[PDB]
Structure formats: structure tokens, C-alpha cells
Amino acid sequence: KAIKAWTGYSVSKWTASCAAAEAKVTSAITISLPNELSSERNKQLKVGRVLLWLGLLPSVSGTVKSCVTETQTTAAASFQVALAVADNSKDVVAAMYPEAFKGITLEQLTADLTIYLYSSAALTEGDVIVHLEVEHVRPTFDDSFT
Amino acid sequence: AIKAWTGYSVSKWTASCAAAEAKVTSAITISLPNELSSERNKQLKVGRVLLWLGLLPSVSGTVKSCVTETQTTAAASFQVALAVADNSKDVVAAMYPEAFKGITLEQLTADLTIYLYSSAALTEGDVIVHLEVEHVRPTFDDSFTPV
Amino acid sequence: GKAIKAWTGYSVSKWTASCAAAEAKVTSAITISLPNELSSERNKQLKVGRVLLWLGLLPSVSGTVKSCVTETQTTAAASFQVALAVADNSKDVVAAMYPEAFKGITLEQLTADLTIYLYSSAALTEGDVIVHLEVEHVRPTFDDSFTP
Amino acid sequence: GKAIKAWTGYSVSKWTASCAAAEAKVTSAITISLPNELSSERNKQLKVGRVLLWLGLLPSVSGTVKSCVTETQTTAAASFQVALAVADNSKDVVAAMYPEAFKGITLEQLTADLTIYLYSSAALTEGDVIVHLEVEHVRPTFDDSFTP
Amino acid sequence: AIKAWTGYSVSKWTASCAAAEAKVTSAITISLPNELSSERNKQLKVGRVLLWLGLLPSVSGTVKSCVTETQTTAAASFQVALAVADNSKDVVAAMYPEAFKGITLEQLTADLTIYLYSSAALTEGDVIVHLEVEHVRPTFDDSFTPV
Amino acid sequence: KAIKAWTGYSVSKWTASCAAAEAKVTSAITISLPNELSSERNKQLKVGRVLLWLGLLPSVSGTVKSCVTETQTTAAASFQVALAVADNSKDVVAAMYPEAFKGITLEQLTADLTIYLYSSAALTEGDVIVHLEVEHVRPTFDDSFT
């Protein structure tokens, strides 16, 4: 299905391939705004709902977990505070934060939040593809002259 | 058992699975059935797509398959698919009600690809990948020419 | 000059068959093969309606050229002696309409029993005659629903 | 004997094309060129309707002469094998009406795609055949107002 | 912006200006546009005539032009013209609403002439003499012949 | 004043400083889409009205003219076909093409149109600043997942 954005809101996405990691190692994955949103005016737009989900190779065995939280000094801790976790054990490998981050600016979103990934077994580059939604108000612009 | 839309009809065809080694993903090409291979018909628009497997009773281990836009690496196809057809589930099938709406049979045959994964080795015919496609009810010429 | 509307519930399928090389006055038999799109067994049991044959000739095709569709005859020449209508080059319209002679048979029967017979007074080189064939028949119906 | 009224909103444009010299049984291709008066780009996008071709022969033109308008074929002779109507000298009326085969294309498409094919059993000298062509098409419209 | 009469249509075409020396008048011939060059069309009757120039941004000095009955001396044409198209005015144009009513395109092409004057020298293309003509809406054959 | 865009339309701008030019020389000025519009989807948006106007140094003497037209093999010719010209002699040094380019895509706009500038006196870099508006439909985007 599709979950339509709120009136006056838009959606953005950007993904990041997982880095190599050993057994049960939790790794941190960075968040960077896309070039469309890196503009000054767009940076100030307020965020709405959010959604996180993973793309796993068909051979990905063991348990794999990921979530988005305010950056924790230790990577593993984030799960212990995340309001939801994307876990491969579930039928749908996703996790929605419908209101956790409502009200922050895209700048804040990219500044303090981060993606955390955990795998019981060892990982290799490209093993896990991290997908992310960011609902926010529509960027807007209009002008004239003389 | 699922009914088709008004103005649409379902075409069904099968493809065998090539021999492959353990844990290695393979690709299976989509070739249109004869009654759709005519130039008039392949221009038709697609609706919903249904994929469901048939396994030999001896099939063991894990087997997964999905149809997606052709990807450079076969394994990666499982990372953009809406629904996967997996043997560990009750019904070994998947549905793509929204993914491929609007595509043409030309594009369906040329762009998509059936990707199949097995934890263990496979031998030819070990899996029968059945594919079912909704599309506009094909139309036929209904008059003779003068002379 | 006219467009023979097909009967309600019927459609028209059209395909060609290039003539094989032949010598003067030699009658040749051309086999009728169903098009791929109809070749499915599901469709093979459909009931034929009106049948129409008409030729296309190279402008340099001299002499007399005749063709008709009949149940396969032991001798090729004999076919014309029973055909109710023959398409000829010399006539105004090079065609032959069989509104009733074959109604009721199955497309499988059409492929198995009937044959296209072609005769040229002068020698024919391949492609000199393009035997067009237009078969009206019940509209084939595709599967209505998925498989659970 | 008859005057085919053009459709409402359509007009008829008529022009000729003298035949080039040719040898016996040689099929020749004659290029279709729009008349100057229609040649404007503004008009080139007009949609064609019915098309009519008919020949004029010197009274001494013996043998058989055939001509038809078809999408350009790789081999000139083949054109007749697909033309739905052919103008022949031997028939009562040396003409060929295409009421539908070309409806919908643009005059630019008409100039680019179709070709006039001509065949004579005997040798032709220049001007022996005057291929008249009459193309019905939407009425061109001129500018309604000045430029300030 | 000016509307044409009922039963009339406007044909517009342009003519470039030939190189000429200072203060010397030149003549420019009127040639019918292709869509009017057919024998049927050139018999048509004319209505109002509009002349207006386009100057290169570098054009300096005085430039004048008018269309009149062909005169033996080019300069003299400015002495019988109703309105002149001059560059010193706001709009570099002229109008001949009554002068040429009733003339035929044959006569318009054969009798009139576009005369152009410049205080300074001109180089080819330095002026684009646009001409706009009202005339009876040309009519087309609307039926095929028997055979 | 300000001339509001049409319902569902937006506005964009981008300027270009004049190059050096000698007396009465007409120069050509290129048009390049901004990075916001260089994206594939935005490129297809249809244009509406347009406006051109200049910024002159206070010392700019003589006559200066500019206009936007389909590229002409010779630079000077463009004026002879422009539906309006921005000329310093007027009170407001501007020229509006309210409908000349309506219906083309931003790609077409950047491909075939070009800016032409003419100065009776010699010019130097920065002497003339060419300002341009491009009204067009709003770029739009919206998405979802699983």
C-alpha cells in the first residue's frame, strides 16, 4: 500500500549501504540531507512522520536489527531508547516513528538523529540496504519583479 | 480465485528453473506466451501480477523468488521487491498489485526479470515458476477487407 | 469498397503464405497453418465461420493464376473441379468468398482437412504469389481469474 | 458520372507527376512531392483524408500499365502485393480509391512515407504516363489578423 | 492586433533590403508567397495593406519606406504615398486602408513596388520589410473527378 | 509592484553579467537552467509568462537594448523578430513576453532561446546585469513505501 503525506507535506528518501561488521557488532550509519534539501530555505522545513525499512540479500541469515534515534555515545544503546525497531524476524522489516520526530527541522533531523544497524552474523558491504522516509512540509517558492 | 478487473483478462505461463549451486541467486527471463507475442497484443497495458511457485516434494532448505526491474546483480533484486515468494511461508507466492500497473507487455518482457534463490543446490525443473498477468482484454479485427 | 462485418461473437484472423516455386501449368498445394496466436489448444476447438481468400501478385505476373480452398484432394488439379468459388487473376477482383462451404468446422479441422491449391499457367518463382487468407471464427476467450 | 464531395472541413488538392523513362517490365518508383501551395510548414501538419489516384495514358500506350500508392517498399515490385487497390489500364476505369488506407496521417507523413509505384509491361518514354493524384485533407486556414 | 474583414484573410511575407549608399532610395520587388502563387489564388481581390519594418539595433539616421504604384524614378515614390513608414516615429509602420482596395494579387505583384530610403548607407539585411495583405479568403476545390 | 504567478505556477530567476563589447556590437548571452531545475522531472515543466530587464551602472551612457528570442544565426537579427525589447530609453528597462513562449518545456527554453544584448557605446564586464524571470508549473513530488 501507500501512506499518503499530510495536507501540505511532501516525502523524501535516501539510502545507505551497510558497512562491513563482525558478529553481533552494532554499527552506526550516517544521515545526510539530499542536495534538493541542502538549500537554506528547505533546511528549515518541519518533519512529520518517518519510516525505516531494510533490504536484505536473500542469503542474509541470523538476526538483523536497525533503528533511528538521537545519536548515542555508544552505538548499541540506541535500540534501548528507540520507539520502534526494524527487525528481520518480523514479517515486514520496517519500523514507523509516526510522531517521535514530529516538529523538528530537516537540519535537526540530519544533525542529531542517526541510523543504527545490528547483525548477529558478520556483514559485508552491500549486505543490507537501509531505506528511510522523511515526511515534511512542501518546499515553496514564488517571486516577481519591478 | 481472485477475480480480474473489468476490461482485463489473465494470461498464465510457466518457466523452469535452471540448475544452480547453493546459496547462489539465479535469473529467469520472461518470454511472452504465443497468444501475446503478436505485435498488436504486446502493446497492451498490464494490471496486477501474481507469482507463485511449484516445488518438487524433495525440495529442502530455503527457496526465494521475486520479479523486479532487471538489476545488474542478480542477488540485489531481493532488496527492492515489494513482496517475495518464499517457501518457508504457508503459500509459496507473492503479489504485486500496484508495482507494475501501467506497464506494457513489451516493457514487462524487456525490463523485468524473475530472480530465484535457493539455500541448497537446484537441478533443472526443481522449481516451476508460474507467472500470472492481468492485462487489457486483447482486441481482434472484426471485419474483412474489400478484396 | 466494402468491409464485411464479422458476426456477433466472431472475430477475423488473417495470415499469408508465400507460394513455392513451380513450373508451367503445375498445380501446387499450399498447406494451411494456424497462426501462433491461435495455435493454443484452448483456441483450436473454436468454430469457424466465413472464409475469404484473395491473392496479391507481382505486377510482372503474366499468364493465368488460379487458387481455391477445398478439402484435400488426392490429385492437386482436381481441387478446382469441386471448389464453389475460385480466385482468378483474369477476373476483376482476385478473391473467392466461401460464406457457407466451411462453416461449423473447428480450427483444428481447418488446419487438418482443407488445403490451399494454387495454379499458374507460367512458371512461378518463390514469392510471386502471396496467398492471403482471412478466417472468421468465434472470439477466443482468455482466463478470467488467477490461480489461488 | 459522379463527383465525390469532400468531407465537411476538408478540401481536395490535386497535382500530377510525369513518369520517368523505363524499360520493359521494370517497376519504377515515383516520389510524391507536395504542391507549393501546400508546402508551407503551417499546412504540413494537416490531416489527410481520402486519397485517389488515376492515370492518363497516351492513346498509343500498349501493353499493361499498373500503379498503386503504398508505404515505401524495399523492393519496388512488392508494392502491388500489399496495395488494397491498383489502377490498371486493362480495367474499365483506370483509377484506385483509397478511402481509408491512409486516413489520419499528416501531409508531411504523406510526403515522407508513401510512394507512387508504376509498372509497364512495355518500355515507357518520359511523359507516357501522367500519374494524377488527388488528396483530400483538412482545409488549411490562413492568419486571421494583422501584426500590431 | 487589427482584425480582418469577414470573407477575408491575411497573408504575410517579408523582403530583405539590398545594400545601398547614403541618401539614395532603393526599390524592393513584391513577390507573392507560395500559398498565393497558384493561378487560382492570384486572381483574388485585395483589401487593406499594412507595411511595417524591422531595423537592426545598430540602424542610425533616417530611414523611410512606402509602397506605391511603380514609378520611373525610385525617389519619387514618396511623393504620391498616403502614409510613409518612417523610423523617426514611435511605430515604424504605415497603413493603406483605402489605397489598394479592389486590386488583384496579380496587379499587386506587377504594379506596386516597395521603395525604401536611408539617410546613411545600408548593408544587406539591415532592414526587414514586412508586408501584410488582406484578401478574399482563398477557396479550394472540394470534390474529386469521376475517374 | 508584483505580478503573481498563475494558479499552480512558480517563478525562477538567474542573471548573467555582460561581456566586453565594442561600439554598436550586439553580443549573445547564454541561458542555463539552475541546479534546482536541472533535475529530470523539473526539466519537463511547461513555461508560462516571461520577463526580461536590465541593471545598468549609473554611468552607462548611450543606447542599450536586449531581448530574448529563438537563437538567430546572426546575433543582431534577434531584435528584428523579438516580440518586445528591453530598451534603456524607456522609463522601465524591461520587456515582458506574456505569451510568446507559453507551452514550451524548461528544456526547450534553455535549449533554443537565448539572450541578446546591444550597446551603442563600448561595454566592460559588469556594465550590464541581465535579469530574467521564468514562470512555470510547480515542480511536484510525493512518495511512500511498503
Author numbering:
A (entry chain I), F (entry chain I): 42 to 187
B (entry chain C), E (entry chain C): 43 to 189
C (entry chain D), D (entry chain D): 41 to 188
Could you give the paper's own sentences about this structure?
Cowpea chlorotic mottle virus is an icosahedrally symmetric plant virus in the Bromoviridae family that infects cowpea plants (Vigna unguiculata). The 180 identical capsid proteins are arranged in 12 pentamers and 20 hexamers. The asymmetric unit (highlighted) contains three subunits A, B, and C (magenta, green, and blue, respectively). CCMV is thought to achieve this by detecting a change in its chemical environment upon entering the host cell, which causes its capsid to swell, increasing in diameter by about 10%2.
Cryo samples of extended CCMV at pH 7.6 (containing no divalent ions) are prepared in the presence of a photoacid (NPE-caged-proton). The sample was plunge-frozen at pH 7.6, after which the pH was lowered to 4.5 by releasing the photoacid. The capsid has a diameter of 32 nm, with the disordered RNA in its interior not resolved. The reconstruction is indistinguishable from one obtained without first lowering the pH. This confirms that the vitreous ice matrix has prevented the particles from contracting, even though the negatively charged residues whose repulsion keeps the capsid inflated are likely protonated due to the high proton conductivity of vitreous ice. Once the calcium ions are no longer present to compensate these negative charges, electrostatic repulsion causes the capsid to expand. We then dock atomic models of the extended configuration into slices 1–12 (extended and partially contracted particles) and of the contracted configuration into slices 25–30 (fully contracted particles), from which we determine the motions of the capsid proteins. However, when we rapidly melt the sample with a laser beam (532 nm), the particles begin to contract as soon as the sample is liquid. When we prepare CCMV in its extended state and lower the pH to 4.5, melting and revitrification of the sample allows the particles to partially contract.
